[PDB]
Amino acid sequence: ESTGNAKAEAESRAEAARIEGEGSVLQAKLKAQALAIETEAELERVKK
Amino acid sequence: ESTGNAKAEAESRAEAARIEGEGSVLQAKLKAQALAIETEAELERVKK
Amino acid sequence: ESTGNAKAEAESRAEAARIEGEGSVLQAKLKAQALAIETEAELERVKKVREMELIYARAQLEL
Amino acid sequence: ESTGNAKAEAESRAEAARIEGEGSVLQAKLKAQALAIETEAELERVKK
Amino acid sequence: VREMELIYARAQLEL
Protein backbone atom coordinates (compact mmCIF):
# COMPACT_ATOMS: atom_id res chain seq x y z
CA GLU A 1 0.00 0.00 0.00
CA SER A 2 2.72 2.57 0.74
CA THR A 3 6.52 2.99 0.70
CA GLY A 4 8.72 6.07 0.30
CA ASN A 5 8.82 9.62 1.68
CA ALA A 6 5.37 10.84 2.72
CA LYS A 7 5.26 14.48 3.86
CA ALA A 8 2.42 16.83 4.75
CA GLU A 9 1.43 20.04 6.55
CA ALA A 10 2.54 23.51 5.45
CA GLU A 11 4.72 25.44 3.00
CA SER A 12 7.45 23.97 0.75
CA ARG A 13 9.53 20.79 0.38
CA ALA A 14 11.34 18.81 -2.34
CA GLU A 15 12.53 15.24 -2.88
CA ALA A 16 13.84 13.92 -6.21
CA ALA A 17 16.25 15.71 -8.58
CA ARG A 18 14.50 17.81 -11.25
CA ILE A 19 17.91 18.80 -12.67
CA GLU A 20 16.33 20.12 -15.90
CA GLY A 21 18.27 23.34 -16.44
CA GLU A 22 21.24 21.98 -14.50
CA GLY A 23 21.60 19.16 -17.00
CA SER A 24 21.25 21.75 -19.76
CA VAL A 25 24.04 23.76 -18.12
CA LEU A 26 26.38 20.76 -18.29
CA GLN A 27 25.37 20.33 -21.94
CA ALA A 28 26.33 23.96 -22.55
CA LYS A 29 25.88 25.13 -26.13
CA LEU A 30 29.28 25.79 -27.73
CA LYS A 31 27.87 28.94 -29.35
CA ALA A 32 26.94 30.13 -25.85
CA GLN A 33 30.53 29.71 -24.66
CA ALA A 34 31.83 31.54 -27.74
CA LEU A 35 29.63 34.61 -27.23
CA ALA A 36 30.88 34.65 -23.63
CA ILE A 37 34.56 35.19 -24.50
CA GLU A 38 33.65 37.31 -27.54
CA THR A 39 31.71 39.72 -25.30
CA GLU A 40 34.56 39.99 -22.75
CA ALA A 41 35.84 42.93 -24.81
CA GLU A 42 33.35 45.11 -22.92
CA LEU A 43 34.68 43.98 -19.53
CA GLU A 44 38.20 44.77 -20.72
CA ARG A 45 37.07 48.32 -21.50
CA VAL A 46 35.85 48.79 -17.91
CA LYS A 47 39.31 47.55 -16.93
CA LYS A 48 41.31 49.80 -19.27
CA GLU B 1 -5.56 10.29 4.63
CA SER B 2 -2.09 11.80 5.03
CA THR B 3 -1.55 11.51 1.26
CA GLY B 4 1.66 12.52 -0.51
CA ASN B 5 4.18 11.59 -3.18
CA ALA B 6 5.55 8.05 -3.22
CA LYS B 7 8.77 6.89 -4.91
CA ALA B 8 8.77 3.08 -4.84
CA GLU B 9 11.99 1.26 -5.76
CA ALA B 10 15.13 2.97 -7.07
CA GLU B 11 16.03 4.25 -10.54
CA SER B 12 16.50 7.71 -12.11
CA ARG B 13 13.53 9.92 -11.24
CA ALA B 14 12.34 13.49 -11.73
CA GLU B 15 9.62 15.47 -9.91
CA ALA B 16 8.98 19.10 -8.89
CA ALA B 17 10.83 20.29 -11.99
CA ARG B 18 11.64 23.67 -13.55
CA ILE B 19 12.34 26.42 -10.94
CA GLU B 20 15.85 25.48 -9.70
CA GLY B 21 16.99 24.03 -13.02
CA GLU B 22 15.67 26.94 -15.07
CA GLY B 23 17.28 29.41 -12.67
CA SER B 24 20.59 27.59 -13.07
CA VAL B 25 20.68 27.81 -16.87
CA LEU B 26 19.63 31.46 -16.59
CA GLN B 27 22.59 32.70 -14.56
CA ALA B 28 23.85 31.60 -11.11
CA LYS B 29 25.93 34.75 -11.71
CA LEU B 30 27.01 35.24 -8.09
CA LYS B 31 28.69 31.85 -7.63
CA ALA B 32 29.68 31.73 -11.30
CA GLN B 33 31.83 34.85 -10.95
CA ALA B 34 32.81 33.90 -7.40
CA LEU B 35 34.31 30.57 -8.51
CA ALA B 36 35.64 32.26 -11.66
CA ILE B 37 37.50 34.91 -9.65
CA GLU B 38 38.85 32.14 -7.42
CA THR B 39 40.33 30.54 -10.54
CA GLU B 40 43.12 33.15 -10.48
CA ALA B 41 44.73 30.77 -7.95
CA GLU B 42 46.56 29.41 -11.00
CA LEU B 43 47.94 32.84 -11.87
CA GLU B 44 48.56 33.32 -8.15
CA ARG B 45 50.81 30.28 -7.78
CA VAL B 46 52.51 31.19 -11.06
CA LYS B 47 53.44 34.55 -9.52
CA LYS B 48 54.40 32.84 -6.24
CA GLU C 1 -14.11 31.11 14.98
CA SER C 2 -10.37 31.80 14.96
CA THR C 3 -10.38 31.64 11.14
CA GLY C 4 -7.26 32.03 9.00
CA ASN C 5 -5.36 30.74 5.98
CA ALA C 6 -4.83 27.00 5.64
CA LYS C 7 -2.19 25.28 3.50
CA ALA C 8 -3.02 21.56 3.44
CA GLU C 9 -0.43 19.15 2.04
CA ALA C 10 2.83 20.22 0.38
CA GLU C 11 3.56 21.49 -3.14
CA SER C 12 4.59 24.84 -4.64
CA ARG C 13 2.32 27.59 -3.31
CA ALA C 14 1.90 31.36 -3.52
CA GLU C 15 -0.06 33.76 -1.28
CA ALA C 16 0.25 37.38 -0.07
CA ALA C 17 1.92 38.33 -3.35
CA ARG C 18 3.27 41.54 -4.89
CA ILE C 19 4.88 43.90 -2.31
CA GLU C 20 8.21 42.15 -1.58
CA GLY C 21 8.59 40.70 -5.07
CA GLU C 22 7.71 43.94 -6.83
CA GLY C 23 10.11 45.85 -4.59
CA SER C 24 12.86 43.39 -5.48
CA VAL C 25 12.53 43.82 -9.26
CA LEU C 26 12.36 47.59 -8.72
CA GLN C 27 15.75 48.03 -7.06
CA ALA C 28 17.15 46.47 -3.85
CA LYS C 29 19.78 49.13 -4.61
CA LEU C 30 21.38 49.15 -1.16
CA LYS C 31 22.30 45.45 -1.04
CA ALA C 32 22.79 45.35 -4.81
CA GLN C 33 25.60 47.90 -4.65
CA ALA C 34 26.78 46.54 -1.30
CA LEU C 35 27.35 43.04 -2.70
CA ALA C 36 28.62 44.59 -5.94
CA ILE C 37 31.26 46.65 -4.12
CA GLU C 38 32.22 43.52 -2.18
CA THR C 39 32.91 41.83 -5.53
CA GLU C 40 36.21 43.77 -5.75
CA ALA C 41 37.54 40.95 -3.54
CA GLU C 42 38.63 39.42 -6.85
CA LEU C 43 40.62 42.51 -7.78
CA GLU C 44 41.79 42.61 -4.16
CA ARG C 45 43.33 39.14 -4.20
CA VAL C 46 44.77 39.86 -7.65
CA LYS C 47 46.61 42.84 -6.14
CA LYS C 48 47.56 40.76 -3.07
CA VAL C 49 49.26 38.31 -5.40
CA ARG C 50 50.51 40.84 -7.95
CA GLU C 51 52.61 42.20 -5.07
CA MET C 52 55.10 39.48 -6.04
CA GLU C 53 56.64 41.83 -8.61
CA LEU C 54 58.41 43.17 -5.50
CA ILE C 55 61.12 40.67 -6.49
CA TYR C 56 63.24 43.45 -8.01
CA ALA C 57 63.08 45.33 -4.70
CA ARG C 58 64.87 42.55 -2.78
CA ALA C 59 68.11 44.23 -3.83
CA GLN C 60 68.05 46.21 -0.59
CA LEU C 61 70.93 48.62 -0.22
CA GLU C 62 70.81 49.36 3.49
CA LEU C 63 74.30 50.87 3.69
CA GLU D 1 -11.60 20.17 9.31
CA SER D 2 -8.30 22.03 9.76
CA THR D 3 -4.54 21.62 9.23
CA GLY D 4 -1.77 24.18 8.64
CA ASN D 5 -0.71 27.52 10.11
CA ALA D 6 -3.65 29.40 11.64
CA LYS D 7 -2.80 32.89 12.90
CA ALA D 8 -4.92 35.75 14.24
CA GLU D 9 -4.94 38.98 16.26
CA ALA D 10 -3.23 42.19 15.14
CA GLU D 11 -0.99 43.74 12.48
CA SER D 12 1.05 41.86 9.84
CA ARG D 13 2.30 38.34 9.09
CA ALA D 14 3.28 36.18 6.10
CA GLU D 15 3.57 32.48 5.28
CA ALA D 16 4.13 31.11 1.76
CA ALA D 17 6.57 32.48 -0.85
CA ARG D 18 5.01 35.07 -3.19
CA ILE D 19 8.35 35.39 -5.02
CA GLU D 20 6.73 37.21 -7.96
CA GLY D 21 9.24 39.96 -8.65
CA GLU D 22 12.06 37.88 -7.17
CA GLY D 23 11.47 35.20 -9.79
CA SER D 24 11.36 37.97 -12.39
CA VAL D 25 14.72 39.23 -11.07
CA LEU D 26 16.29 35.81 -11.66
CA GLN D 27 14.77 35.82 -15.15
CA ALA D 28 16.43 39.20 -15.76
CA LYS D 29 15.81 40.66 -19.21
CA LEU D 30 19.05 40.66 -21.22
CA LYS D 31 18.19 44.13 -22.54
CA ALA D 32 17.99 45.27 -18.91
CA GLN D 33 21.51 44.01 -18.23
CA ALA D 34 22.79 45.70 -21.39
CA LEU D 35 21.42 49.14 -20.49
CA ALA D 36 23.08 48.69 -17.09
CA ILE D 37 26.64 48.48 -18.43
CA GLU D 38 25.87 50.93 -21.24
CA THR D 39 24.81 53.55 -18.69
CA GLU D 40 27.94 53.05 -16.53
CA ALA D 41 29.58 55.76 -18.65
CA GLU D 42 27.88 58.31 -16.38
CA LEU D 43 29.33 56.71 -13.23
CA GLU D 44 32.77 56.79 -14.85
CA ARG D 45 32.37 60.54 -15.36
CA VAL D 46 31.74 61.04 -11.63
CA LYS D 47 34.93 59.02 -11.16
CA LYS D 48 37.08 60.93 -13.67
CA VAL E 1 43.90 47.15 -1.38
CA ARG E 2 45.36 49.50 -4.00
CA GLU E 3 48.04 50.20 -1.38
CA MET E 4 49.73 47.07 -2.76
CA GLU E 5 51.42 49.19 -5.44
CA LEU E 6 53.81 49.91 -2.55
CA ILE E 7 55.76 46.95 -3.97
CA TYR E 8 58.25 49.29 -5.67
CA ALA E 9 58.92 50.96 -2.31
CA ARG E 10 60.26 47.74 -0.74
CA ALA E 11 63.64 48.74 -2.15
CA GLN E 12 64.42 50.49 1.12
CA LEU E 13 67.79 52.18 1.19
CA GLU E 14 68.30 52.70 4.90
CA LEU E 15 72.03 53.41 4.69
Author numbering:
A (entry chain A), B (entry chain B), D (entry chain A): 717 to 764
C (entry chain B): 717 to 779
E (entry chain B): 765 to 779
Task: Please quote the paper that reports this structure.
Using x-ray diffraction and computer modeling, we have inferred a draft atomic model for the major vault protein, which forms the shell-like enclosure of the vault. Each half vault consists of 24 identical pairs of MVP chains A and B. Chains A and B differ only near their C termini. The cpMVP model contains 749 of the 873 residues expected for this construct, starting at residue 3T of the N-terminal cysteine tag inside the vault waist, and ending in nonequivalent residues 779 in the two C-terminal cap disks. The MVP structure in the “crossover zone” reduces the vault symmetry from 48-fold in the waist, barrel, and cap helices (residues 3T–715) to 24-fold in the C-terminal cap disks (residues 716–779). cpMVP model chains A and B become nonequivalent in the crossover zone. The asymmetric unit of the vault is thus a dimer of MVP molecules (model chains A and B). The whole-vault model (48 cpMVP dimers) is 675 Å top to bottom, and 417 Å at the widest part of the barrel. In domains 3, 4, and 5 (as currently folded), side chains of Trp 143, Trp 196, and Trp 249 are located on an almost straight vertical line. An amphiphilic crevice that could bind lipid was found at the top of the vault shoulder. The answer may be at the top of the shoulder region. Domain 12 of each cpMVP chain overhangs two copies of domain 11 to tie together groups of three cpMVP molecules (see left panel of Figure 4 and top of shoulder in Figure 5I).
